[PDB]
């Protein structure tokens, strides 16, 4: 159960890192769009 939980936590951490990177890219794009207007 600990091995399964560690694998699930690693997968969830990878997914959360991907979501955070996507959110950071979206925030940068929105800041650029606001600065360009």
């Amino acid at each position: 159960n600990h091995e399964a939980a560690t694998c699930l936590e690693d997968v969830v951490y990878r997914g959360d890192m991907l979501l955070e990177k996507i959110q950071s890219a979206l925030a940068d794009i929105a800041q650029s769009q606001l600065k360009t207007r």
Binding site: K21, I22, A25, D28, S32, Q33, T36, R37
Partner: protein, 62 residues
């Protein structure tokens, strides 16, 4: 004729038509201000296109 027409009205109508065509094209304010605004809009469009190309081509995720 008077050696012994409607030029004013024609010129007024021509000026009105030219002003209408300019306001339809964008000649309604000062020329320098309009040129600066057009240059700024072109620069903004170019910056937006460059940002889109930089954010779309080199995708971080895969």
């Amino acid at each position: 004729m008077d050696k012994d027409q409607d030029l004013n009205a024609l010129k007024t109508k021509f000026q009105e038509l030219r002003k209408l065509i300019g306001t339809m094209p964008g000649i309604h304010v000062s020329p320098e201000q309009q040129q600066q605004q057009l240059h700024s809009l072109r620069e903004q469009v170019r910056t937006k296109n460059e940002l889109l190309q930089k954010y779309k081509s080199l995708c971080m995720f895969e």
